[PDB]
């Protein structure tokens, strides 16, 4: 069937249901941010308050599909990274944690011609 | 394009059933004085309360006026410190949250409603304070608009007055088989909509403006031919060239 | 499809039993393997499994060809990696 | 007759100019995609071109 | 310093500020400098506004 999905909002002596969407059969990532944002397939559907925590109770995959190998939960922090996107999909990543990588991700280049490039002191 | 402003309206939004609540706003006042017309006993309510916040994915705002002028009629106007007017909120505007109050709210815009009981300086009947956030889930609407899996409607291949995920314009919407795996809409560097998904299906649709630019060959005070992207035009012959 | 893939959980060579089919339990969840494989939620050959196990296999369309796998086999599957330092 | 051979080249660290070394402003500035690249490399690739033209017409014997 | 003395029977209140102003109450404390400074519950001549809001049951404050 089509699945109609709701936030059950619980408060000190109440429950309310806010309707979200007819959830498409084609979701592949959910990312929930500490600052309240929930992004589904890379798009930010929801904004919410600061979160203390999340509980999950995910139910195992539908065993008529391939259902071999792993699905992954990543605990993560925000960082500036240079990303190359093709067809909306990440091809490559570079992390601006060091002064050679901060040069690359200031010139928006994964690799550079020899030269003198302006950099700030650390 | 010859369409004489008979053009269809289109509305594409994240998949919904008809999930509708009205924000009925009642404004009330009484008037008196025989030397000049002046205002007493004003009150305002939103669904019968003093403040309201929308939880349903569609709403309509309505004004009811319940004005009792002895001089026979009242004319009415609005001042808006706001990116909408009440009658415009209904014309498919999309929000993340939307709350309305007869008293100030943290970020609020004001719509002030005025009555002119004897022509000259009017009087404030009420002030409505709107707190809202630009977003995707809650849409203003004219009337509860029917559907079971989706609320959306499109006319394809014809110039349409579209609202698509909060982008407004005139354009031709065409199904393209260039499926794209992330996001919901794709925009130019110019911040204009180029394509969007019907996210309950995966199908992607492309938006093109319904009048394209051309160059007119003008010679001896007539247009003798036109250079175009289009396969058809008012001239009786057409020729295809590489570009 | 005819592909090369890695899988794990609790499965053959306390948290599960296997027979010649089987039953496995962890984290308030029970998985039953029969002709089809099933899941349930429940608070807390005659072969017994005490520790998680991994298998790497490649498919003949009959999946029958495989090698048992050590620690650190998870990094073969395409949607998982060993996270680097920092 | 006086003929000018060269212009004294100038270079900018766009993050230092725009943000005074404020970290939260640098974090915002990276959202303006390649605004810095398209300033810095226009000044650096021009300062390089002057260096190779002028040092290559000043052939001493 | 702000003291709130709110007596909500529903158990708690969240509180927020709007500034038509080049500061916020806790930021005035962070070493700002002035030639004069007057505060009132009623409108003073050149004045900016801080408006203080409570949310006693979540939604409209
Ligand atoms: C307002 C409210 O009901 N809060 C509940 C809290 O009682 C509960 O213990 C926690 C556990 O999931 O979930 C939330
Ligand atoms: C912790 C908790 O809420 N338990 C529920 C359980 O009742 C339900 O069976 C399961 C989904 O099937 O999700 C979890
Ligand atoms: C229609 C409505 O909502 N209520 C009032 C009604 O009680 C009142 O008598 C009249 C004049 O004040 O104005 C309106
Ligand atoms: C990936 C692919 O098949 N692209 C084509 C497209 O170029 C062609 O114009 C269209 C016509 O239906 O069919 C699709
Ligand atoms: C009908 C056709 O094929 N071409 C004619 C062309 O001969 C004629 O000159 C023009 C009006 O001048 O109308 C068109
Ligand atoms: C012939 C063939 O493709 N079968 C192979 C097997 O021999 C090889 O060991 C495995 C990868 O290790 O891939 C599968
Ligand atoms: C500092 C001050 O005024 N104290 C008051 C107390 O008198 C009052 O009863 C309470 C509720 O009004 O609020 C506080």
From Swiss-Prot, chain B:
Residues 130-243 are annotated as: Interaction with host ANPEP. It comes from Porcine epidemic diarrhea virus (strain CV777). The KxHxx motif seems to function as an ER retrieval signal. Belongs to the alphacoronaviruses spike protein family. It is found in: Virion membrane; Host endoplasmic reticulum-Golgi intermediate compartment membrane. It comes from the Viruses. This is Spike glycoprotein. The chain holds residues 488 to 730 of 1383 of the full protein. Homotrimer. During virus morphogenesis, found in a complex with M and HE proteins. Interacts with host ANPEP. S1 region attaches the virion to the cell membrane by interacting with host ANPEP/aminopeptidase N, initiating the infection. Binding to the receptor probably induces conformational changes in the S glycoprotein unmasking the fusion peptide of S2 region and activating membranes fusion. S2 region belongs to the class I viral fusion protein. Under the current model, the protein has at least 3 conformational states: pre-fusion native state, pre-hairpin intermediate state, and post-fusion hairpin state.
């Amino acid at each position: 069937v089509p699945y109609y999905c709701f936030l059950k909002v619980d408060t000190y002596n109440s429950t309310v249901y806010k309707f979200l969407a007819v959830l498409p059969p084609t979701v592949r990532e959910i990312v929930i941010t500490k600052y309240g944002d929930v992004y589904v397939n890379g798009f930010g559907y929801l904004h919410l308050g600061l979160l203390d925590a999340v509980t999950i109770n995910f139910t195992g995959h539908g065993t008529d599909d391939d259902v071999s190998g792993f699905w992954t939960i990543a605990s993560t922090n925000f960082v500036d990274a240079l990303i190359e996107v093709q067809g909306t999909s990440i091809q490559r990543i570079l992390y601006c944690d060091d002064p050679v990588s901060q040069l690359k991700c200031s010139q928006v280049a994964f690799d550079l011609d020899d030269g003198f490039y302006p950099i700030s002191s650390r | 394009n010859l369409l004489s402003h008979e053009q269809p309206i289109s509305f594409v939004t994240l998949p919904s059933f008809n999930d509708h609540s009205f924000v009925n706003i009642t404004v009330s006042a009484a008037f008196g004085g025989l030397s000049s017309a002046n205002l007493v006993a004003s009150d305002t309510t939103i669904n019968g309360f003093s403040s309201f916040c929308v939880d349903t994915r569609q709403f309509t705002i309505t004004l009811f006026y319940n004005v009792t002028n002895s001089y026979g009629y009242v004319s009415k106007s609005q001042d808006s410190n706001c990116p909408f007017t009440l009658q415009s909120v209904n014309d498919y505007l999309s929000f993340s949250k939307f709350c309305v109050s007869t008293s100030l709210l943290a970020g609020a815009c004001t719509i002030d409603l005025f009555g002119y009981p004897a022509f000259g300086s009017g009087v404030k009947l009420t002030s409505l304070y709107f707190q809202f956030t630009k977003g995707e889930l809650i849409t203003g609407t004219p009337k509860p608009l029917e559907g079971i899996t989706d609320v959306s409607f499109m006319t394809l291949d014809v110039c349409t007055k579209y609202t698509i995920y909060g982008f407004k314009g005139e354009g031709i919407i065409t199904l393209t088989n260039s499926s794209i795996l992330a996001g919901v809409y794709y925009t130019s560097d110019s911040g204009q909509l180029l394509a969007f998904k019907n996210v309950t299906s995966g199908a992607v649709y492309s938006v093109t403006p319904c009048s394209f630019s051309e160059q007119a060959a003008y010679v001896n005070d007539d247009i003798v031919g036109v250079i175009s992207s289009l396969s058809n035009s008012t001239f009786n012959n057409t020729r295809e060239l590489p570009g | 499809a005819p592909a090369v893939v890695v899988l794990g959980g609790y499965l053959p060579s306390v948290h599960g039993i296997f027979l010649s089919v089987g039953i496995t339990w962890d984290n308030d969840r029970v998985t039953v393997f029969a002709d089809k494989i099933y899941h349930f939620y429940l608070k807390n050959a005659m072969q017994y499994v005490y520790t998680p196990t991994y298998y790497m296999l490649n498919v003949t369309s009959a999946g029958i060809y495989y090698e048992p796998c050590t620690a650190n086999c998870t990094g073969y599957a395409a949607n998982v990696f060993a996270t680097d330092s920092n | 007759e006086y003929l000018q051979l060269y212009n004294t080249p100038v270079s900018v660290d766009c993050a230092t100019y725009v943000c005074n070394g404020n970290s939260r402003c640098k974090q915002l500035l990276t959202q303006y995609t390649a605004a810095c690249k398209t300033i810095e490399s226009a000044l650096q690739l021009s300062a390089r071109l002057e260096s190779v033209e002028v040092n290559s017409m000043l052939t001493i014997s």
